[PDB]
Design a protein around this nucleic acid. Structure first.
Lengths: 144, 129, 149
RNA sequence: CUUUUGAUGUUAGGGUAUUGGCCUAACAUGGCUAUGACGGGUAACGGGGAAUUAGAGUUCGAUUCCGGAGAGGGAGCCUGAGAAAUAGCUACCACAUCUAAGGAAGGCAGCAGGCGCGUAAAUUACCCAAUUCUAAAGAAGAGAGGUAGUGACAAGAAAUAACAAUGCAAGGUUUGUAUUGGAAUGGUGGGAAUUUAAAACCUUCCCAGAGUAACAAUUGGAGGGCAAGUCUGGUGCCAGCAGCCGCGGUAAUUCCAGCUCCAAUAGCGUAUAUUAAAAUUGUUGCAGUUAAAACGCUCGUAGUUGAAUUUCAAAGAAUCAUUCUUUUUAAAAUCCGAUUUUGUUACUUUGAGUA
RNA sequence: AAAAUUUUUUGUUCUUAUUUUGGCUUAGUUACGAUUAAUAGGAGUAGCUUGGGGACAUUCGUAUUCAGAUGUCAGAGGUGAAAUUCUUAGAUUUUCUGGAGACGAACAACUGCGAAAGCAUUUGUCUAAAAUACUUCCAUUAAUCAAGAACGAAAGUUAAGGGAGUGAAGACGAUCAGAUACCGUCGUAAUCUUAACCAUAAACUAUGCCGACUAGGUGUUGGAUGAAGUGCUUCCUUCAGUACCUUAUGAGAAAUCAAAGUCUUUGGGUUCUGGGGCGAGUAUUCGCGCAAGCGAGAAAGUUAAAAGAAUUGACGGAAGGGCACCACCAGGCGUGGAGCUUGCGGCUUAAUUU
RNA sequence: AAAAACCGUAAAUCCUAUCUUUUAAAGGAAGGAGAAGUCGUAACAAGGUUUCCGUAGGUGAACCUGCGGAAGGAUCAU
RNA sequence: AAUAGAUCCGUAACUUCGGGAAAAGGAUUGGCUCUGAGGACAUUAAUGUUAACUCAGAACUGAAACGGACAAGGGGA
RNA sequence: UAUGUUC
């Protein structure tokens, strides 16, 4: 045969099989399990504002060798501690120790990116001023 | 359990002219397989078949012309409206220029073209091309 | 095969000729009486047909007369209340249970008794779906030993 | 599971606008459930619809319309044809305003607007002129509604030039290309016609009004995927880049810069979610010896699936050589040699009714 | 037995009956009335049929071991070598007798039976199964199956019995750097029987079950058919098992597969299972269990591979060949054994340049 | 008309119980990641005791051993 | 000292599945006037005679009280 | 068919 009921009245069996089996893949389970709301810190949001706790250098992976400059952020929406990478060459100096900072995902949803381990977020602007507006060129005003 | 008789008949036909044996024996004859064979005949895919009518739901011997690419059944016999004939055709037949999708309709066994020309699509039986 | 393996295509194939054989100048005016006497003497219809074929040389009672043997037995009222095959299965189950009671360590006998009782239940369901068996017929395993009657 | 606390039904009544366990009394023990009852979750108002689609599908739908529900949370009630109404009342809970301290008064999930919450969202504007509603119905009202303001949410059209002569390159006097040098036209400012409830916008006309047309286009890249650099400096496993593979320890095509080039273009990146890609959820349409995956084996109920068999053909006109159209041929009731119905359903065909 | 029609007794009013038909009973007449018998299924019957199918009882065999006896005298066991161990009270060894428990060799097979786990001394009884043969019976009674049920190696658990041999634990003796291991000596539980649990195995052909079709050969097991070296043996055909070889203009990633084929020319029926790796068969909860545990069974977090097959090379306390005094051997000649030059290491080095 | 009583509609408060979600914690015990750390050599070759399964016991650890299995073996084979 | 009888309701952890348990914890209870249910016996499907206290329900009633005295568990981790 | 670690 084929391994599946092909009868003209087997719709119940086929539907139930599909319903049970779609839980077996990571995409559907991740997108339909109620855990995500409580597990991820953003609570489903694309961005979040938080307060800088301090700045830390994180080792790169073994094949590489670098000190990625990240910041520890206390989210004002919840109160969760997260680690957000700070893109740019000297952008860590552009952020002080107690500022409001907007952070977003790192581009791979809840996955780490590159040689940076355990970091899932990146800073997009500090003191409502863009890191892009501060680093690539001083086209926008400096730190307020 | 044989379940469907016409499925076994068409599978045997297919294996037979893949081997090119030019003559094949179909054991469990039935009226449905007989009409399917006559439709194949009238479309020119087989020769003069003869049904050996024994007292035991007799057999059929059909002459092949080495002329059928593939004959097969469609199980279950989905009931198709006149509207979904095109949807079935572009998915089953190899081209819109040849091949036949066989339907059982309130007016008998027929292919998709004459089912269209006579209206009243019915249940799908099989195909051959 | 219902249980186990093996196709086992061994069987008997009736001849093409449906009618009474030409060489049989015998008249069917007494063949039904012969089978009735044989059943009265006590024979299940299967062995009635076998005895008829062997000792009487009249194969295919259906060919000799256009009516079959269990059907004429029913028409005369001789047919038993339990069909032949079901009764034989019940007898086999009774024998197997009688043996098992002495030898409860016969796991194989227990397994085959389960198989036989499954067959009994299926065929009894069929026979009571037809009107050949009372609707309350159950085959409890306690009094099947005397249920043969 | 439901059933003392109405659960299922009968009888009688009460109550209602009316039917009804809606409620009451008596009585009976029923009602639903693996075809998933009863529960739990929903970051669930439902639908018309939306996105993505070759066909199937997957996801979304608070939000123009329709239906439902609510007016801080409950409950109760008056008037009334219509309300269990909330810019109606009564009480409790939580808030909260004034007070001379005795007492009064409140409900923006209406329109603006404010605080708070946040990643996340506009003016405490003008008008009933249009649409329409209410009235004692032309003439009054209407934050319904319309108009404008903010508005790179989306969507559409569309500037940032075009042209003539040499010099140069290519080609048998043809294309591209730096200099000149005159036309053309918006953007812009002003007046006007117009529009408009008034005003503004658009459109149209008249004055000025482009040469570095400074009236100066950006965003993101240039190792591969993937279009575009083994160009020049700085750094030197640091800083950093990098969705993935990877680059960086002195020649870095990958970092930081300049030049040039590429891509899309008044738009271009980033994050998250979703669809296709995904035949990686497979009905169409996956895989299961060894990549993940045949229950240790058999029986077996529900489910799914199930051998063959009952009414077959002949003849006649039209396209092109075929195809296509039409009549009858058992039996029972209808019409005095002829007049007309002969299981149920699925399924399929046509309609009706489709905001 | 009633309806319809008609006639009608008779002073606001009372009979009745007649004839056609819808329904009950009673002779006869219809073409009076039942589809095959599936290379579906079940049942039956038959064979100086088959089989290590099952249960109970029974019988035999050597070996081992214990006890007794027997003859002789220095060792015997065991290992790579030993040692632990036994041994003048006679070990080991020879022969005999009795007992005990387990096991059932050789025959014994790419053989048989069973659903699987599994099943091998004789005989008896009970019991079932399958194939074959059938002009025997029934006539769709069937296929696969969530739940549910029976069985389910070994180990393990409970309680009696048994207890030779082997032997998880343990104790020694060795080896080794260590050795709690591999090796040796001993040895508890267990292994065996009975009665209950447990329900798991690489429980494996890693391949669910039913059905159809597609190719040649070599066998082999059990029947049936026909014919012939000598009442007897072989060959032919065929059914049903069971393997193997070859072949694929069949499949597959390939190894390979006669199914893992008849699949983008995708649908015979049906059940179960899988969706990158780790976390994890973990946590929690529930059911079962005496317990050990079994069945059902996540998430957070983490990660760019994990995995399959095959090719080349390299390697092997892998095999088979060949070669070499920078290898050994038929055999010798020296250094490090003697003191001294020299280079390097190293030794404090304004430098002992590198 | 105040007022009172009784059926009923019934807010609200409190006690008790259960359930759901979140959460502290001495101690315990995992998993993942990191660094040239310590000890051994378990597996891959016959990996130097073939490997692996189920089960049971033992040991510093990998692991060892008994019983019964499998070849995915190092044997398709007198 | 605290209830403690009876009826109705409700009852956890744990467990050797037997218990724990009267777990814990709630409600009711008098009098009076009624209603309903539960049997035995004889006459030619129906009509009379007659007996226990036992439950259930409803009105009314009272200084909200009723196992009114007597009698009679304190529970839980 | 003595044992014989690691990088």
């Amino acid at each position: 045969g084929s391994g599946k009921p092909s009868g003209l009245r087997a719709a119940r069996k086929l539907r139930i099989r599909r319903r049970t089996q779609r839980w077996a893949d990571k995409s559907y389970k991740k997108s339909h399990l109620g855990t995500r709301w409580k597990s991820n810190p953003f609570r489903g949001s694309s961005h979040a504002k938080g307060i800088v706790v301090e700045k830390v250098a994180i080792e790169a992976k073994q094949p590489n060798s670098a000190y990625r400059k990240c910041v520890r952020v206390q989210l004002i929406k919840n109160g969760k501690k997260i680690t957000a990478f700070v893109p740019g060459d000297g952008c860590l100096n552009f952020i002080d120790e107690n500022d409001e900072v907007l952070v977003s995902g790192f581009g791979r949803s809840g996955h780490s990116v590159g040689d940076l381990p355990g970091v899932k977020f990146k800073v997009v602007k500090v003191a409502r001023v863009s890191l892009l507006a501060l680093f690539k060129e001083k086209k926008e005003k400096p730190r307020s | 359990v044989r379940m469907s008789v016409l499925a076994d008949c068409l599978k045997t036909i297919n294996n037979a002219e893949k081997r090119g044996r030019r003559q094949v024996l179909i054991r469990p004859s039935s009226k449905v397989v007989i009409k399917f064979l006559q439709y194949m005949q009238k479309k020119g895919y087989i020769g003069s078949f003869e049904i050996v009518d024994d007292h035991r739901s007799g057999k059929i011997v059909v002459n092949l012309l080495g002329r059928i690419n593939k004959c097969a059944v469609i199980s279950p016999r989905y009931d198709v409206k006149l509207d979904e004939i095109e949807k079935i055709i572009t998915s089953i037949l190899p081209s819109r220029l040849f091949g036949h999708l066989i339907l059982t309709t309130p007016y008998g066994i027929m292919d998709h073209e004459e089912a269209r020309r006579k209206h009243t699509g019915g249940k799908v039986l099989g195909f051959f091309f | 095969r219902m249980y186990g393996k093996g196709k086992g295509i061994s069987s008997s194939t009736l001849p093409y000729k449906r009618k009474q054989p030409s060489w049989l100048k015998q008249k069917p005016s007494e063949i039904e009486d012969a089978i009735i006497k044989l059943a009265k003497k006590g024979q299940t219809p299967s062995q009635i047909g076998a005895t008829l074929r062997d000792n009487y040389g009249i194969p295919q009672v259906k060919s000799v007369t256009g009516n079959k043997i269990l059907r004429i037995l029913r028409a005369q009222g001789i047919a038993t209340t339990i069909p032949e095959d079901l009764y034989f299965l019940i007898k086999k189950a009774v024998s197997m249970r009688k043996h098992l009671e002495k030898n409860k360590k016969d796991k194989d006998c227990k397994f085959r008794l389960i198989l036989t009782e499954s067959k009994i239940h299926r065929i009894s369901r069929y026979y009571k779906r037809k009107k050949l068996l009372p609707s309350n017929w159950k085959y409890q395993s306690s009094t099947a030993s005397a249920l043969i009657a």
